[PDB]
Symmetry: D2
Subunit: 223 residues, 4 copies
Amino acid sequence: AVIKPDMKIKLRMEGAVNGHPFAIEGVGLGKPFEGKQSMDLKVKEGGPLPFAYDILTTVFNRVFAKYPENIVDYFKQSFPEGYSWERSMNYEDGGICNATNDITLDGDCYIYEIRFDGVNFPANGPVMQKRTVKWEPSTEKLYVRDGVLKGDVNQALSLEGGGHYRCDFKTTYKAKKVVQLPDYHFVDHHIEIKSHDKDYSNVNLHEHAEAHSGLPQAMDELY
Amino acid sequence: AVIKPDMKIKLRMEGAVNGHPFAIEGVGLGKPFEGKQSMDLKVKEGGPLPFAYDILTTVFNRVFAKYPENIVDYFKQSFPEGYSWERSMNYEDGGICNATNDITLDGDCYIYEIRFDGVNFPANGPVMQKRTVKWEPSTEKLYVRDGVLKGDVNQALSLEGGGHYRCDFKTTYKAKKVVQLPDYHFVDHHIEIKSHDKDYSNVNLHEHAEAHSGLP
Amino acid sequence: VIKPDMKIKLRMEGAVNGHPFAIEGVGLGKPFEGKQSMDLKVKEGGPLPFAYDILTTVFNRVFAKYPENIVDYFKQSFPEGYSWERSMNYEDGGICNATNDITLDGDCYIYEIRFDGVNFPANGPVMQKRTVKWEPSTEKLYVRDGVLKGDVNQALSLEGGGHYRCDFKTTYKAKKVVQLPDYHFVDHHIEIKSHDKDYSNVNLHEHAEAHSGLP
Amino acid sequence: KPDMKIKLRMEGAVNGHPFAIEGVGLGKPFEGKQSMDLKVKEGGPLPFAYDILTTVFNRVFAKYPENIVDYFKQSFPEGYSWERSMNYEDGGICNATNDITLDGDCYIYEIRFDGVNFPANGPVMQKRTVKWEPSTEKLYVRDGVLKGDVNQALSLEGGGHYRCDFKTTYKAKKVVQLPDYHFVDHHIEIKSHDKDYSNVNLHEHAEAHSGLPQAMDE
């Protein structure tokens, strides 16, 4: 079996925010068929991070999403060869982050090679002045274009003093081998930083994702 | 006492697309607590419509949304005074539609006053060429900003050749009277043109909506 | 067909955040000198609760100084005329859609204008009327799929010295088939020279000259 | 001085594929002209349109009259940095940064470039771009730093244009006086290149102005 019920994660992120480079490495594990995962992240270079850690969390794997068999699982199909994705995150105040992830499989551990580059974050904004609290739960929209899978969702960070700071996500998912393409569908996400020290040198990060097909006659009419 | 399990709708939309004016009137009904509604629309002016009818359906009332006790219902609370909304629909090929709706209540019947204006639709695009089929199901996202309720959601129209045509929705909801504001929440929507004549002069439109709080 | 001295007559009907208004204007200009002026009067919806500056660019490319160097799409379109559609996307989410159907009767261009703006926040510079003037700008014109397009990032200066940006997307459609120009620019300068307290009366000026970029 | 030297190193990736480029150049800052030769050291042959990098390959090479405060010439010898997002109309996005220092008469650039979501069938990946049209960048002050905004366009082979929205932030390393709202006309040209663009000779010309003026030309 290519995907086991308990798999491991190893990653290294190299990047920059507003021109200032940094590097972070992480080790984790998750349940691909339950859509749950967790990891411990450590800042290796550029610490203490001068920006909101929240802008990186969604960059720190689609295979960790619970897909019903009614909907084709593009990502679980892509293994053992793996897949890659590119993402642009356009925040409403002009800050923009571009990120890439090359995902491979080694035994039962997923390996990420991540690049992250954010620019145009204003000094007085919530990212530079580290005013974010958490990502709100979100519903990602998946669709096929040019034979690859695309991901579109407008996200929102809850802010310190209340209110929300929005970000437009545009993701392209590319399997390394030929796989079957899914129909238009959704994936609900919930990402949470469970623990951290002051300068976010150590971060414990949790993610939970479930695919669905939108407003249904639902299945909860007993049995 | 204000909203009954069965209410009615009467509406008139006046607008233009790429400078060509049109007018549409509709009558319908729905169940606010079940989040379902239906209506029959008719083209009164500007027919036959030279653009895809689907760009108007989401303009043809969140009061017809199933709200759990979990979430404050901004819209049902806004009556009998009613509420209004403004919306911008930014399609990925540059077409932009601006819409407003002034919603009042007369007895058991909702009255909509709708204005609709779309521009910069290219002649070879799916809207002017009428290549759309149905809005994909969507999850509308609602949040508070500067004391008013806002709606942000990237929608998608499925196209005839199987492709998809995306649109960014930005809605502002304003209650006529001071109403308690809800927390961050969602509303799943499913809208369908169930029946129509050849020229879309007659359209029977159904919508179904249920609010929720995202992945728990 | 186009005389050195022409006149302008227009009526704008529209709404901002759902509140309707109507404005009528009469003006004068010199198409070959790229200058024009007009007096506008609010007929309905006054006093206007929004910044008047968001309407001035909607209140005619034919009033642009074109060299021999560049094909003049707009002067060619007459006597049949042309129309245009425009979206104006302000950086705080406010967006205005406008159309203008321009015809010619004798010396006078006749505009039929529709204007609709939504999602302007109550605390923003438009609803608070904190705008001063449009900065002069360079509009880029190009052909796409047989139509002439108008693209430019504008900016309104604010009372406290700040700037409020807006992205213009314009489509120009001649009533009859004309020859399309190549990629070029049009510099703009638009000014409200005079007005009454609530902008019931506005005197507006515009100056435009086409060019083909850094030589 | 009227004649300066340029040294740069660009490291980056497009759609996840890394590449590296080095360049040496020279220009006339007070005349708003500059030239350089660029060489690919890693990631060649480049699988994307070279035109997306040229505008990343220094506003100090812009002719500013005494009419307008020169934010960029003021920032030296300490130098300045800039960040830029380039939003192409088909979804492709490039983020770029440049840290500019001065060693004698030679400018040294530390450049990072990252582009994503370029479609396989688009003009960047299919390499169907010709050149950037001349443009007019508009510069203004926000939160004490200088901003650059301009919607630009690339011509394609079979005719037509492929648009890109530039948003640039310029940050001087020392305290300098801030300019008023103004413009800078720009024209960028690849004067020569070999088949796989592994070597490129690149020219740029820039002049600042204040918009439609009583015009001085008389």
